[PDB]
Ligand binder design. Sequence first.
Ligand SMILES: [Cl-]
Ligand SMILES: [Cl-]
Ligand SMILES: [Cl-]
Ligand SMILES: [Cl-]
Ligand SMILES: [Co+2]
Length: 129
Amino acid sequence: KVFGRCELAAAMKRHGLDNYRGYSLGNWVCAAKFESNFNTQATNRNTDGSTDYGILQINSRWWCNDGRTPGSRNLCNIPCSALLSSDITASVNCAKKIVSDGNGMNAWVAWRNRCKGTDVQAWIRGCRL
Ligand SMILES: [Cl-]
Ligand SMILES: [Cl-]
Ligand SMILES: [Cl-]
Ligand SMILES: [Cl-]
Ligand SMILES: [Co+2]
């Protein structure tokens, strides 16, 4: 699925991200835009042999098992394939674990580089949530 901005905003709200660990919904929408371009199927290979998966580009070195990342962990206890569903539940649930790992949304460099410091509330403007 390729989500629309407000479509994703609504789905993330329904799955409990609005103000999760102190991060307003706009942060999550902005992160998804710059990580995956709202694309649930997005994958990107990394220099270390890990891959980023799905709408929030969750990395196989720490968070999910793809059986092709030597030395990696699976801290969300899920196969990375689950993060390539059109339904965002698995990605949201794993993101909640990532953000609670005690470094906030800094885990998403695209968020820190392209969202943090901007008015992220603009990302949910005009959505009827
Ligand atoms: Cl997998
Ligand atoms: Cl969904
Ligand atoms: Cl899940
Ligand atoms: Cl917001
Ligand atoms: Co990445």
